[PDB]
Every structure is written in structure tokens, then in C-alpha cells.
Design a protein around this ligand. Structure first.
Ligand code: CLA
Ligand code: CLA
Ligand code: CLA
Ligand code: CLA
Ligand code: CLA
Ligand code: CLA
Ligand code: CLA
Ligand code: CLA
Ligand code: CLA
Ligand code: XAT
Lengths: 208, 41, 162, 211, 64
């Protein structure tokens, strides 16, 4: 009744197709329990969002570096951006860790206690700060009212999962082609279209 | 999955969780901090 | 300079031993190239030896007639002089040992209040063990509060043959 | 009673009952016993009450010291400068302090075990005025501002006391990794907020990244 | 009728038994005038491996 990850196979019992981006691919039986599934879905959503932001940033700075700007490549970016900076390391590390502790702790307690942070505790915010779904918050993180329609919200959730999976699969590819060619991803893309027959993953010495 | 996580609570939880944790903790302490014969007071 | 000992900072045997080890380690440096992995390993071992001798010394640690550091253990005798650090800080072991004992005793009592507490011993209740492990930081307070209430012992319910 | 320390999923057991400054913070479940809870609240009250006087004695004098009104030393060496003066006793302050402090500490101790146990045949003529109202809350000691009808003033007292305790711990730790005063370490934090930080100024966490 | 209530936990008072000063559940009490009619059952096994034994009426005490 739905397209599966392996045409002809049978999906598991705990994967009916009601989840966002469900395809029936789970061979190691992970997320079989309801609580484990509740944790795994949020882990996938947070990984998809962080992967989409990181891949977009890497492509942006790489395209800007190929255009002519003073942007370093995605790899070794933190090395040459810290030598000429007034923000000290350690202090910057713990500043980032301190802000992320507050945000991630509120998000974690929202998962264990669904709809709990929106009780006027954090500076008096009752309507917002309470999630609508599992890993889909609302109220403040939805400026445009695009979540108040299930017919479009379901399709938009599907688009988010299918784009995040491709983005994280692309991020894994960023490390591999960098470690195999020592060049920028936009430099590897432009070099592949310049010679699609000669240059490829098999004519670069490494990975043979 | 419930049977695998309940299998992981018999002998690994006591012989490979604690043993690996305690051994790794003492070893990393003796690796980053070299040989300690006093309270360095 | 107590119990007839002398500070490790003014002992000839301490320096003699230091030079002995620095020499036996340096004798192995000639058998290798000045820029390879065995040379780097021998250099790291030499640096650790020099640091250890410097760290062991100038810290109140004193040796006696052989260059080997001796340890003062009597409280009062180790408190009147700067020797409290060498062994009088027994409270570190007492804290970790009491932590282990309190966590195990809390797991035995709580697990016994359940039907058949046996299979709970061979198959640990990991969420209960992890919760009880991070809840026993203030173990001496729980021990003194569990002693005054009489909930630490039993009156006369023991398998005895006396 | 008052807002929980966390927004959710943290329900305590023995914190449901009404108490001064009740925020529901007890992760180790130390105050489960009622008698131990009743003793721990008195300990918290005494610790906060003395930490408040200590933090004001340090901070209020440090304000005038950093501005330039007085020439008094800082708190970490105020002891090393009191006794070198010509008119200052030897180390007998500790003994007279122990004796004169134990005398009233035992009165406060016997009052907790038996509340209001100050019979007529104990003192000279003020043997009746030492009858406290509650444990840790006496009446004849304080003269004004206490015949009101609403008790949440004690919440301000407990909140100020908790903030004072945390402040003294910061005084002892900041002056242990930098060797300066509290306002001396505060004034430098206003100049360079990213350089003088516990993660990188003092040797607090081992950060060795000097590439 | 003469022994304790069936199903009630009791305490053994035999000074030479493996369950001395222990607590055991009474399974049945015989009414034939035998020497040891109160039959009890304990959670923990003895050195031999059995877990039940029968005691008399005088060597059976109520729990605490
Ligand atoms: C040869 C006889 C014999 C045998 C086979 C046993 C066997 C056992 N005894 Mg026993 N005992 C004996 C004689 C014996 N005893 C005698 C003579 C006495 C004196 C009368 C006792 C008194 C005694 C007591 C008081 C207790 C036992 C307990 C136990 C059980 C211990 C289970 C365990 O691994 O502990 C546990 C070992 C651990 C290391 C637990 C720590 C778990 C950590 C905190 C979990 C964290 C790991 C983490 C999740 C992993 C992440 C790591 C990652 C970073 C890689 C075990 C089945 C204990 C029990 O009941 O089990 C609970 C118990 O408390 N015995
Ligand atoms: C509310 C009390 C308080 C305040 C206002 C400060 C303020 C300051 N501290 Mg300090 N500190 C405190 C408590 C406090 N501390 C406690 C309890 C400890 C013991 C763990 C320390 C240990 C400490 C060290 C070792 C160092 C500082 C340093 C500093 C200065 C730079 C900030 C920093 O590096 O991170 C601060 C480090 C902390 C551990 C504080 C963070 C956690 C606290 C306890 C939370 C309390 C904050 C409160 C809820 C909200 C602010 C209240 C305020 C508006 C009144 C800064 C002016 C550094 C310095 O002097 O720069 C050279 C430094 O090296 N602090
Ligand atoms: C996310 C999709 C994606 C895309 C669009 C690209 C694209 C590209 N890769 Mg790459 N790669 C990827 C994933 C991807 N890769 C992953 C996951 C890995 C880790 C195994 C690698 C490892 C890798 C290496 C080592 C190299 C490249 C190289 C290249 C460039 C030349 C083509 C080639 O020979 O690659 C080889 C093809 C593969 C390794 C197959 C990967 C297929 C994955 C699973 C994605 C498939 C999903 C989907 C069907 C494709 C995208 C759809 C659409 C956008 C086209 C090219 C622009 C080469 C280069 O740097 O150019 C000089 C190079 O040497 N890739
Ligand atoms: C490679 C095969 C292998 C090996 C080497 C062992 C070895 C062991 N088993 Mg295991 N077992 C196996 C297969 C194996 N088993 C399989 C296939 C199953 C079925 C799933 C089990 C099920 C099983 C159960 C249910 C239990 C054991 C227990 C034990 C331990 C004996 C009790 C003891 O040491 O005294 C007892 C020790 C004390 C009372 C003092 C407590 C402090 C201890 C020493 C700390 C624990 C550290 C650990 C024992 C050392 C490292 C373990 C090692 C495997 C790396 C022992 C080390 C018992 C156990 O868990 O140990 C407690 C026990 O309860 N085994
Ligand atoms: C469970 C006890 C324990 C503890 C407390 C540590 C702690 C640490 N390990 Mg480690 N490790 C352990 C067990 C442990 N290890 C075991 C059992 C193994 C064998 C599998 C390893 C193998 C290992 C390697 C190979 C490395 C470390 C490294 C490190 C350090 C950096 C990791 C980090 O930043 O995490 C968080 C820090 C919290 C304080 C860190 C202080 C890394 C290191 O050397 O640092 C440079 C390193 O490369 N560990
Ligand atoms: C059973 C353990 C033990 C033993 C064998 C000793 C033995 C000794 N202690 Mg001692 N002590 C102990 C426990 C012990 N202590 C404990 C638990 C404490 C509390 C922490 C102290 C605190 C203490 C102090 C404060 C002093 C000693 C001193 C002494 C020495 C002289 C005793 C004396 O009365 O002077 C002579 C007797 C003439 C008849 C002596 C070798 C004294 C010392 O260190 O010598 C300078 C000293 O003043 N001890
Ligand atoms: C946490 C459980 C626990 C606790 C609280 C105690 C407590 C005690 N034991 Mg004991 N013991 C235990 C486990 C425990 N034991 C086990 C597993 C064994 C079998 C190896 C023994 C064998 C033993 C002997 C032979 C003797 C004692 C004795 C004593 C008493 C003297 C103090 C001491 O440290 O002796 C020493 C204790 C040991 C050498 C055991 C150390 C092994 C570790 C700590 C046990 C592992 C416990 C486990 C991690 C708990 C699980 C945690 C949970 C969250 C899953 C003391 C009340 C002595 C006594 O008779 O009383 C005066 C004595 O002679 N014990
Ligand atoms: C000795 C100081 C001290 C003492 C005795 C207490 C005692 C108490 N506090 Mg408290 N508190 C303190 C300091 C102290 N506090 C400080 C400095 C702060 C600011 C961070 C707070 C913030 C605070 C809150 C928000 C709450 C309490 C509450 C309570 C009561 C709950 C029961 C309990 O936790 O047992 C007593 C606790 C102890 C005896 C702590 C023991 C000391 C440990 C072992 C060392 C900790 C080291 C530290 C991490 C560094 C209790 C009577 C709750 C309450 O008011 O109930 C109505 C409540 O919600 N406290
Ligand atoms: C926890 C309570 C506490 C403690 C233990 C101390 C302890 C001390 N104070 Mg202090 N003080 C406190 C509270 C406290 N104070 C409070 C609440 C204030 C009001 C803000 C002051 C204001 C104060 C001043 C103005 C002075 C002291 C001084 C002193 C030192 C000598 C006292 C003396 O000889 O009389 C007074 C000595 C005079 C010369 C006058 C001494 C270490 C004196 C000092 O040495 O400076 C640090 C000093 O002049 N204190
Ligand atoms: C791919 C990935 C996960 C892949 C997981 C897979 C396939 C799991 C598959 C299965 O589990 C199923 C489904 C079912 C199971 O039964 C079986 C298996 C088979 C196990 C995660 C990537 C996840 C990737 C993430 C989250 C990446 C984030 C990147 C960030 C944040 C970037 C930061 C940057 O820093 C850099 C790196 C460089 C700087 O120059 C620039 C900035 C931008 C600063």
C-alpha cells in the first residue's frame, strides 16, 4: 500500500507507515519499543536539521570561496579562523556549551514530559513553547502559520525527512571526497563536469 | 529488542561495563597525569 | 627532617639514583637514529623520569639513607609538618569505599521488596542501578541519618546457632 | 509551593508540604526523613544567616576599597594584617571565640530538641524572653519589623541567604585561581569579557590548545 | 482449628532447625493430634535443598 525500501519485502510490525518518512527499513530491529522509537525519531529529526544546516553552510562558503571571497574551505576552517580572532578558545567552547545546555535541557524535558515547558515558567510563555508533535515544536518556531493544516503539514514533514536524509548522506560524502582529493566540494563538482569520463572516484590514487 | 536489552543486563553490565569503565578511568588518569605518590600539597 | 629522615631536596643518594636512571636510559639513545620512533620513545621516557624526580622532590617528600622517599603516617606528626598529603588523606579512599557500600546496600534493600528478588540479582535492573549510583554522592549524611532512626540494623532476626 | 527548579518531569515526594523558600530542589532525596528534614532546614537557616553577614563584610568593604575611600586589605589577607599591628592579641581569638560561641550555640541546640525549654529557674531575669516562636525564628532578639501578618519575607531571607552562600563559594574559588579580590576580578571582567573567563583565565579546566 | 490460621506467616522457634528465628508461611495445620502438625513453607531453601518443614504448636510464634 506504500513504497517500501526493498520492493517485495515486508515491513516490520512497529512500522505501519504513520511515521514521518516511513519506508520500512529497520533490519537491526532498533526502535522496536515505544519509548525507544520515541527517542529515535527525535534523534533522526535533530540529526536531519543539523545536517541540513551544516551542509548548506559548507556549500555556501565553498561556493563563495570559488567565486573569489576570503572564505576558507570546509575542512581546516577552524584552524585559520582562530589564529586571527580575538575570541579565545576554551572561552568560546564553554560559551557555546553553556547556551546549548539551556536549550537542549528544555528540549529534553519536553520529550520526557510532553507539553510541560509551556506553563509560564520561562519568562511567562504559555501558548508557545509546547510541541505539537513528537519532534515538531510550535508556537515560537513557526512564524508563518504553515502547521495549522494537517493536509499540508503531513506532506511538509515528509519533505523535511527526505531532504535531511539526503543532506546527512551528502555530509558523509564531504569527508570522503575531502580525504581522498584534498580539495573543496565545489571544486570537486566543477572538476567532475569538466571531464565526466576520465576523472571519477577510481582515478584519484586513493580508494583503489 | 527487549530480549537483547535484557540479555545485556546479566554478565556484561557487571563484567564489561564497570570493568571497562573503571580500567579506562584509572588508565586515562595515569596517562594524562603521570605517576602520583602524594597529594601534591 | 623528622624520624631521623632528611628532605629529598638535600640528599646525595636521591641525586645519585636520579643520575643512575638518566644514564641507563641515555645509554640506549646511541643505538638509534636521532630522529626516529625509538629515539622519540626514549626521549619521552627520559622527560618523564626528569619530571617525576622533580615532582617527587621539592614537595616536602623526604627519603632516608638510600634516596628512596619515605612516608609519614601518624596524624599530628604528619600535620605538624608539611606531610599531611602523603598518607593522612585517607578520606579519599574512605569516600569512594563508602560510596560503593551505600550504593550496594541501597540496591539490596530496594530489590528485596519485590516478588522473587533473586532473578533481579543475576539480571540487574540497570535503570535502578544507574539511578542509585548517581544518588549516593552525599553518602555520609544518609549513613548518619539512617543510624539515628534505627533503620541500619536488626534487633534479633539472624540465623544463629549460639 | 513556589515555582519548581525545573519546568517539568521532576516530581519530589517530601517537598509537597509547605515550607519557607520551597522550590522543590532535592535530587538526592536527602530530606526524606521528617526529623532529618526539620534539622536540615535549621542548618540551612543558620548557614545562610552567617553567609549573608560574611558576604556583606567582604563585598561592602571591597566597594570602598576599589573606589578609594579606605585603605583596608582584602579578605584573603585581612587575617595576615590584623595580628602584625602592635596592639593585637596572640592567637587567643580562636579560643575565646570557641568558648563564647559555644555558650550560645548550646542554648540554640537545647532549644531545637525541646522547643521553648527555657524555664524560670535558668537565667537571671530574662529567663522568659528567650521563648522563641518557632524553630529558627525567635521573637525577643529582633526588636522591629516583625509583627506583620504575612510571613513571605522569610522567602526573601532564604533567597538572599542562598545567594549569599553561593557568593561566598565564588569568593573562595575566584580568589584561589586568580589571587585577586572579588571586585578586583569583577572589574577586570567588565574590561575584557572574553579573555578573563574561568574556562581560559584561571587554571580551572585543562585547556591546552595553542596551535 | 488448634493451629494458627492457614496462610498466615509465623516464626519458627526450634533451636536446631535451619529456619531458626526466620519467617515462614503456614501451608496447612493437621487436626489429628500428631506431635508436629503445623506445616510451614519458606522462600529460602535449606542445606539439603528442601523448602518446607512441619513444626509443633509450641515452636511456632507470630511474626514480630
Ligand atoms: C562463590 C560464591 C559466590 C558467588 C558465585 C556470588 C555471586 C554473586 N554475588 Mg555474592 N556473596 C558471597 C558469595 C558469592 N557470591 C559471600 C560468601 C558473601 C558474604 C556473605 C556474599 C555477599 C554478597 C552481597 C552483599 C552481594 C552479593 C552479590 C552477588 C552477585 C553479584 C552480581 C555482580 O556482578 O555484582 C555487581 C557488580 C557490579 C560491578 C555492579 C556495578 C554496576 C554499574 C554501576 C553499572 C554501570 C555500568 C555502565 C552502565 C556501563 C557503561 C560503560 C561504558 C562507559 C563502556 C553475584 C551473582 C551482590 C548482588 O546481590 O548483586 C546486586 C550483593 O550485593 N554477594
Ligand atoms: C552568582 C554568583 C557568581 C557570580 C556573579 C560570578 C561571577 C564571575 N565569576 Mg564566579 N564562581 C561562582 C559564582 C559566581 N561567579 C561559584 C559558586 C564558583 C565556585 C564553583 C565560582 C568560581 C569561579 C572561578 C574559578 C572563576 C570565576 C570567574 C568569574 C567572573 C567571570 C565569569 C566566568 O568566568 O564564569 C564564572 C564561573 C562560574 C563557576 C559561575 C557559573 C555558575 C554560577 C555558580 C551560577 C550562578 C549564576 C546565577 C544563577 C546568575 C547570575 C547572578 C548574578 C546576576 C547576581 C565573573 C565576574 C572567573 C574569573 O574570575 O575571571 C578571571 C574565574 O576564574 N568564578
Ligand atoms: C549525497 C550524494 C552524492 C553526490 C551528489 C555526490 C557527487 C560526487 N561525488 Mg561523492 N560520495 C557520496 C555521495 C555523493 N557524491 C558518499 C555518501 C560518499 C561516501 C561513500 C562519497 C564519496 C566520494 C568520493 C571518494 C569521491 C566522490 C566524488 C564525487 C564527484 C564525482 C562523482 C564520483 O565519481 O563519485 C563517486 C560515486 C559514489 C561514491 C557513489 C555514492 C552514492 C551515494 C550513496 C549517493 C547516492 C544517492 C543518490 C542516488 C545520488 C544523488 C541524486 C542526485 C543529486 C544525483 C561528484 C560531484 C569524487 C570526487 O571528489 O570528484 C573528484 C571522489 O573521489 N564521492
Ligand atoms: C566466554 C564465556 C563466559 C565467561 C568467561 C564467563 C565468566 C563468568 N560468568 Mg558468565 N555466562 C556466559 C558465559 C561466560 N561467563 C553465558 C553464555 C551466559 C548466558 C547468557 C552467562 C551467564 C552468567 C550469569 C547469569 C552469571 C555469570 C557469571 C560469571 C562470572 C562468575 C562469577 C564470579 O566471578 O564470582 C562472583 C564475583 C563476586 C561475587 C564479586 C563481585 C565483583 C566482581 C568480581 C566484579 C565483576 C567483574 C567480572 C566478574 C570480571 C570481568 C568479566 C569478564 C567476562 C570480562 C564469571 C567471570 C555470574 C556473574 O555475573 O558474576 C558476578 C553470573 O551471575 N554468567
Ligand atoms: C570509561 C572511563 C574512561 C574515561 C573517564 C575516559 C576519558 C577520556 N578518554 Mg578514554 N577510553 C576508555 C575509557 C575512558 N576514557 C577505554 C576503556 C578505552 C578503550 C576502548 C578508551 C580509549 C581511549 C582512546 C583511544 C582515547 C581516549 C581519550 C580520552 C580523553 C578524551 C575523551 C573526551 O574528551 O571525552 C570527555 C571528557 C570528559 C572529562 C578523556 C579524558 C582520547 C585521548 O587520548 O585524549 C587525547 C583518546 O584518543 N580513550
Ligand atoms: C592508635 C593510633 C595513634 C598512635 C599510635 C599515635 C601516636 C602518637 N601520636 Mg597521635 N593521633 C592519632 C592517633 C595515633 N597517634 C589520631 C587518630 C589523632 C587525631 C587526628 C592524633 C593526633 C595527634 C596529635 C595532635 C599529636 C599526636 C602525637 C603522637 C605522638 C606522641 C604521643 C604523645 O602523647 O606524646 C608524648 C607522650 C609522652 C608520655 C605518638 C607517636 C603528637 C605528635 O605528633 O608529636 C609531635 C601530637 O601532638 N597525635
Ligand atoms: C555492596 C555489597 C557489600 C557490602 C555493603 C558489604 C559490606 C561488608 N562486608 Mg562484604 N562481601 C560482598 C559485598 C558487600 N559487603 C561480596 C560480593 C562478597 C563476596 C566476594 C563479600 C564478602 C565479604 C567477606 C568475606 C567479608 C565481608 C565483610 C563485610 C563487612 C566489613 C567491611 C568490608 O568492606 O569488608 C570487605 C568486603 C569485601 C572484601 C567485598 C568487596 C567486593 C565488592 C565491593 C562487592 C561488590 C558489590 C557490588 C558492586 C554491589 C552491586 C551494586 C548494585 C548497584 C548493582 C561489611 C559490613 C567482612 C565481615 O565479615 O564483616 C566484619 C568479611 O569478612 N564481605
Ligand atoms: C549547608 C547548606 C545548605 C543546607 C543545609 C540546605 C538544606 C536544604 N535545602 Mg538548600 N541550598 C543551598 C544550601 C543548603 N541547603 C544553597 C547554597 C543553595 C543555592 C544553590 C540552595 C538552594 C536550595 C533550593 C532551591 C532548595 C533547597 C532546599 C533545601 C531543603 C531540602 C532538603 C535537603 O535538601 O536537605 C539538605 C541538603 C543538604 C544538607 C546539602 C548537604 C551538603 C552536600 C553534601 C554538599 C554539596 C556540595 C555542593 C554541590 C558544592 C533543605 C533543608 C529545598 C527546599 O527549600 O525545601 C523546601 C529547595 O527546593 N536549597
Ligand atoms: C562573618 C563576619 C565577620 C568576620 C568574621 C569579620 C572579621 C574581621 N573584620 Mg569585619 N565586617 C563584617 C563582618 C565580619 N568581619 C561586616 C558585616 C562588616 C560591615 C560591612 C564588617 C566591616 C569591617 C571593617 C570596616 C573592618 C573589618 C575588619 C575585620 C578584621 C579585624 C576585626 C577587628 O579587629 O575589628 C575592627 C578593626 C578596625 C581597625 C576597625 C577581621 C578579620 C577590619 C579590617 O581589618 O579590615 C579588613 C576593618 O576595619 N570588618
Ligand atoms: C549520515 C548519518 C547517519 C547515517 C545512519 C544510517 C545510514 C543508519 C542506518 C540504519 O539505522 C537504520 C536507519 C536502521 C538500522 O536498523 C540499521 C542501520 C543500517 C544501522 C548521520 C549524519 C549526520 C551529520 C550531521 C548531523 C552533520 C552536521 C554538520 C555540521 C553541524 C557542520 C559543521 C561544520 O563544522 C563543519 C563540519 C566544517 C566547518 O568548516 C563548517 C561547519 C558548518 C562549522
Amino acid at each position: 500500500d506504500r513504497p517500501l525500501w526493498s520492493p517485495g519485502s515486508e515491513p516490520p510490525a512497529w512500522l505501519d507507515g504513520s511515521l514521518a518518512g516511513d519506508y520500512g527499513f529497520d533490519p537491526l530491529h532498533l526502535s522496536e519499543e515505544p519509548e525507544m522509537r520515541k527517542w529515535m525519531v527525535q534523534a533522526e529529526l535533530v540529526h536531519c536539521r543539523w545536517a541540513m544546516l551544516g551542509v548548506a553552510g559548507i556549500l555556501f562558503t565553498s561556493i563563495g570561496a570559488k567565486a573569489g571571497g576570503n572564505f576558507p574551505d570546509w575542512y581546516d576552517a577552524g584552524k585559520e579562523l582562530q589564529k586571527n580572532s580575538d575570541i579565545p578558545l576554551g572561552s568560546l567552547i564553554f560559551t557555546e556549551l553553556l547556551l546549548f545546555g539551556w536549550v537542549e535541557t528544555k528540549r529534553l524535558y519536553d520529550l520526557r514530559n510532553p507539553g510541560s515547558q509551556g506553563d509560564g515558567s520561562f519568562l511567562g510563555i504559555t501558548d508557545g513553547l509546547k510541541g505539537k508533535e513528537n519532534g515538531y515544536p510550535g508556537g515560537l518556531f513557526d512564524p508563518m502559520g504553515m502547521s495549522k493544516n494537517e493536509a499540508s503539514f503531513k506532506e511538509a514533514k515528509q519533505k523535511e525527512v527526505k531532504n535531511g536524509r539526503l543532506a546527512m548522506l551528502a555530509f558523509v560524502g564531504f569527508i570522503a571526497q575531502h580525504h581522498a582529493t584534498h580539495k573543496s566540494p565545489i571544486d570537486n563538482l566543477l572538476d567532475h563536469v569538466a571531464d565526466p569520463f576520465h576523472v571519477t572516484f577510481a582515478t584519484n590514487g586513493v580508494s583503489i | 529488542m527487549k530480549d537483547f536489552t535484557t540479555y545485556l543486563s546479566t554478565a556484561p553490565v557487571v563484567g564489561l561495563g564497570w570493568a571497562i569503565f573503571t580500567s579506562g578511568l584509572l588508565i586515562e588518569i595515569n596517562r594524562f597525569f603521570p605517576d602520583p605518590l602524594v597529594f601534591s600539597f | 627532617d623528622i624520624a631521623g629522615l632528611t628532605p629529598c631536596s638535600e640528599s646525595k643518594a636521591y641525586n645519585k639514583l636520579e643520575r643512575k636512571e638518566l644514564k641507563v636510559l641515555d645509554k640506549r639513545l646511541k643505538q638509534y637514529e636521532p630522529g626516529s620512533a625509538p629515539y622519540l620513545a626514549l626521549q619521552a621516557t627520559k622527560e618523564r623520569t626528569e619530571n617525576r624526580f622533580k615532582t617527587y622532590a621539592k614537595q616536602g617528600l623526604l627519603c632516608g639513607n638510600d634516596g628512596l622517599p619515605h612516608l609519614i603516617s601518624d596524624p599530628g606528626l604528619a600535620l605538624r609538618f608539611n606531610h599531611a598529603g602523603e598518607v593522612f588523606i585517607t578520606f579519599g579512599f574512605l569516600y569512594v569505599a563508602g560510596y560503593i557500600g551505600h550504593v550496594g546496600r541501597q540496591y539490596i534493600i530496594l530489590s528485596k521488596e519485590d516478588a522473587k528478588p533473586t532473578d533481579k540479582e543475576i539480571i540487574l535492573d540497570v535503570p535502578l542501578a544507574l539511578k542509585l549510583a548517581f544518588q549516593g554522592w552525599a553518602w555520609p549524611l544518609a549513613s548518619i541519618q539512617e543510624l539515628r532512626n534505627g533503620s541500619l540494623l536488626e534487633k534479633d532476626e539472624n540465623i544463629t546457632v549460639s | 509551593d513556589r515555582p519548581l527548579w525545573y519546568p517539568g518531569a521532576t516530581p519530589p515526594a517530601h517537598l509537597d508540604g509547605s515550607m519557607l523558600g520551597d522550590y522543590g530542589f532535592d535530587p538526592l532525596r536527602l530530606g526524606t526523613n521528617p526529623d532529618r528534614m526539620k534539622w536540615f532546614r535549621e542548618a540551612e537557616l543558620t548557614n545562610g544567616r552567617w553567609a549573608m553577614a560574611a558576604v556583606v563584610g567582604i563585598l561592602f568593604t571591597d566597594v570602598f576599597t576599589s573606589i578609594g575611600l579606605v585603605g583596608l586589605p582584602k579578605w584573603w589577607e585581612a587575617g595576615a594584617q590584623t595580628y602584625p599591628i602592635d596592639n593585637q592579641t596572640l592567637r587567643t581569638l580562636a579560643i575565646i571565640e570557641f568558648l563564647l560561641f559555644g555558650w550560645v550555640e548550646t542554648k540554640r541546640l537545647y532549644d531545637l530538641r525541646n522547643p521553648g525549654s527555657q524555664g524560670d529557674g535558668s537565667f537571671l531575669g530574662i529567663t522568659d524572653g528567650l521563648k522563641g516562636t518557632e524553630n529558627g525564628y525567635p521573637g525577643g532578639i529582633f526588636d522591629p519589623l516583625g509583627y506583620s501578618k504575612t510571613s513571605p519575607e522569610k522567602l526573601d531571607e532564604l533567597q538572599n541567604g542562598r545567594l549569599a552562600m553561593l557568593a561566598f563559594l565564588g569568593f573562595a574559588s575566584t580568589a584561589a585561581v586568580n589571587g585577586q579580590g572579588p571586585i578586583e576580578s569583577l572589574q577586570t571582567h567588565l574590561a575584557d569579557p572574553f579573555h578573563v573567563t574561568f574556562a581560559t583565565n584561571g587554571v580551572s579546566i585543562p585547556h591546552f590548545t595553542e596551535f | 482449628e488448634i493451629g494458627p490460621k492457614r496462610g498466615s506467616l509465623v516464626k519458627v522457634l526450634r533451636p536446631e532447625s535451619y529456619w531458626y528465628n526466620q519467617v515462614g508461611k503456614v501451608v496447612s495445620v493437621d487436626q489429628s493430634g500428631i506431635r508436629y502438625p503445623v506445616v510451614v513453607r519458606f522462600e529460602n531453601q535449606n542445606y539439603a535443598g528442601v523448602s518446607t518443614n512441619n513444626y509443633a504448636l509450641d515452636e511456632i510464634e507470630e511474626v514480630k
